């Protein structure tokens with residue numbers, strides 16, 4: 001039954017996420033338009049996000065346009081994660097408020113975990129796999145926008161070195177969502193039992209799928225803690241940008257996620 005549960009989780013991930021590691025690797029293997037400088041950013045925008053640059057002199061600064069594009073992907077991924085969570089045994093049986101709380105704290109940890117699948121050491125896929133933005137270009141942006149993506153590349157290079165596949169990532173994302181220590185949960189006991197169940201599925205799956213790496217489960221527990229810290233730091237940077245960059249608006253769904261988070 002635990003093998004069946006692992007497969008159900010994987011099937012739910014394949015249905016619900018537009019991007020996965022298989023799809024990303026096909027693309028990254030060599031088509032995506034390469035964004036490596038301001039000229040190619042602007043060319044890519046004209047083809048792939050035309051509306052955002054159809055304002056002439058009224059267009060926002062390039063860094064702010066990138067900030068906006070990043071948030072759009074997060075909004076869509078939050079929708080995918082909310083539908084995915086229904087496949088987790090017990091999740092749909094929880095009080096609606098607890099569902100909201102688990103998603104509030106888990107979505108960005110899951111986002112940064114899955115973001116790793118579209119990253120290599122030189123850059124990352126964007127716009128549903130139709131662009132590839134270089135790591136060096138993102139580092140070249142004016143402060144503080146150059147500080148957004150680099151810590152996520154750093155996380156991703158080490159996470160990708162574990163050589164997880166989608167079957168593993170689906171269970172890891174389910175485990176992220178099930179954390180029983182999120183602030184403000186009502187039914188901690190039922191959430192802890194839901195978490196115990198999914199973590200048991202994850203541990204057995206990693207044992208079967210990665211017999212060569214006897215420590216992969218505790219490695220991933222540590223990655224979960226690393227992701228929590230990465231999200232805490234990211235939220236702090238987002239708040240700095242919101243307060244100091246008059247054009248860098250935050251989408252209302254994301255402002256609700258960030259509100260009172262850390």
Ligand SMILES: CC[C@@H](Oc1cccc(CN(CCCOc2ccc(OC)cc2)c2nc3ccccc3o2)c1)C(=O)O
Pocket residue numbers: 019044045048049066067069070071073074075077111112114115118126127131133148149152238254
């Ligand atoms: C800034 C505040 C914002 O921070 C971030 C920080 C890091 C990553 C994201 C979301 N993200 C990057 C999208 C870039 O999207 C474009 C699109 C077009 C473009 O130029 C034409 C440039 C960038 C992403 N990709 C994914 C791929 C797979 C799985 C999950 C994914 O998550 C948001 C937040 O907090 O929401």
